[PDB]
Amino acid sequence: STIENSFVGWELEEVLLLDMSLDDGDSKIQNQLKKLQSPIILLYCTKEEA
Amino acid sequence: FCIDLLIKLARTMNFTYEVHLVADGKFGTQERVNNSNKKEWNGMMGEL
Amino acid sequence: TYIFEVANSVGLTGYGYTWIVPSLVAGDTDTVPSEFPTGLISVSYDEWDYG
Numbered sequence A: 001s002t003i004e005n006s007f008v009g010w011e012l013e014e015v016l017l018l019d020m021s022l023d024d025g026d027s028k029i030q031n032q033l034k035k036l037q038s039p040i041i042l043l044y045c046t047k048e049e050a
Numbered sequence B: 001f002c003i004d005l006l007i008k009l010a011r012t013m014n015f016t017y018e019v020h021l022v023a024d025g026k027f028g029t030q031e032r033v034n035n036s037n038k039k040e041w042n043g044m045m046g047e048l
Numbered sequence C: 001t002y003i004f005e006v007a008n009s010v011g012l013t014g015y016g017y018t019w020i021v022p023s024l025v026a027g028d029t030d031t032v033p034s035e036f037p038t039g040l041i042s043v044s045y046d047e048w049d050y051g
């Protein structure tokens, strides 16, 4: 809402949903981790997930 | 031009209509809504 | 075998990923290790037409 509220030319690469309850969840996550090129990443997690 | 164009359209595909002119008389684009923090439309597509 | 394992663990089996290996790398054609990705291309000598 705020990023399009400011109508300057932003560039949102991707948004990620992480599933740590499944061991194969990390392997699934690796596919989009291959798409990690931005130098800045916004993190959302708890400490144990951190 | 638009008037007889829409009457031709009404003659072709048989609709009912009303016509009226806009209040501000202006196109409308992404502009700040009274020095707020919001850039929105106005004019024809503003109310469309 | 280790190379293919690493490749398919990272996810190098996607579209456009074309692999060309000589006969020494691929060994024998009949022996197909499970690490071989689908669409894997190799180059060797004529073993079928050239008896």
Ligand SMILES: *[C@@H]1O[C@H](CO)[C@@H](O)[C@H](O)[C@H]1NC(C)=O
Residues within 6 Å of the ligand: B013, B014, B015, B016
């Ligand atoms: C358009 O054609 C329909 C179908 O016969 C007709 O009922 C209608 O009167 C025409 N236009 C309208 C919506 O009045």
Ligand SMILES: *[C@@H]1O[C@H](CO)[C@@H](O)[C@H](O)[C@H]1NC(C)=O
Residues within 6 Å of the ligand: B033, B034, B035, B036, B037
């Ligand atoms: C302009 O918008 C602000 C809210 O962003 C409002 O508080 C203010 O009263 C408005 N003023 C006019 C003239 O519309």
